[PDB]
Amino acid sequence: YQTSNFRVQPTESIVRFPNITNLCPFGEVFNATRFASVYAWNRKRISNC
Amino acid sequence: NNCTFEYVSQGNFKNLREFVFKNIDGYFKIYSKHTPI
Numbered sequence: 529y530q531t532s533n534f535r536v537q538p539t540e541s542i543v544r545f546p547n548i549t550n551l552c553p554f555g556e557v558f559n560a561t562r563f564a565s566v567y568a569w570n571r572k573r574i575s576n577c
Numbered sequence: 578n579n580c581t582f583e584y585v586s587q588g589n590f591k592n593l594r595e596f597v598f599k600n601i602d603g604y605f606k607i608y609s610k611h612t613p614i
């Protein structure tokens with residue numbers, strides 16, 4: 529006589545993303561020798577990393 | 578102006594270089610391949 533199923537799930541699940549960033553040198557933008565003025569604030573993008 | 582998304586990669590007419598381009602979701606995706614024929 530059918531009793532029930534069993535929705536097993538050992539060690540839940542694993543979350544995986546690719547290897548570490550590539551072309552994200554945040555240091556030279558944030559530890560830069562060259563900063564900007566407040567009215568002349570710079571604008572540079574970070575992308576694909 | 579706006580390229581912050583910059584990217585860097587008798588012989589019988591021995592070549593075939595096709596750059597056929599299609600758009601999905603509005604945002605452009607290049608599709609291409611160079612077949613030496």
Ligand SMILES: *[C@@H]1O[C@H](CO)[C@@H](O)[C@H](O)[C@H]1NC(C)=O
Pocket residue numbers: 578579
């Ligand atoms: C970049 O795109 C914006 C969006 O319309 C435009 O207003 C601006 O003029 C572009 N950049 C330059 C330097 O023209």
Ligand SMILES: *[C@@H]1O[C@H](CO)[C@@H](O)[C@H](O)[C@H]1NC(C)=O
Pocket residue numbers: 585586
């Ligand atoms: C040709 O395509 C490859 C794709 O991996 C790219 O790396 C390369 O820069 C392209 N150009 C040349 C001249 O090889």
Ligand SMILES: *[C@@H]1O[C@H](CO)[C@@H](O)[C@H](O)[C@H]1NC(C)=O
Pocket residue numbers: 602603
């Ligand atoms: C431009 O594209 C958008 C969505 O991709 C569409 O809604 C709009 O009608 C298009 N405009 C023209 C002039 O093709």
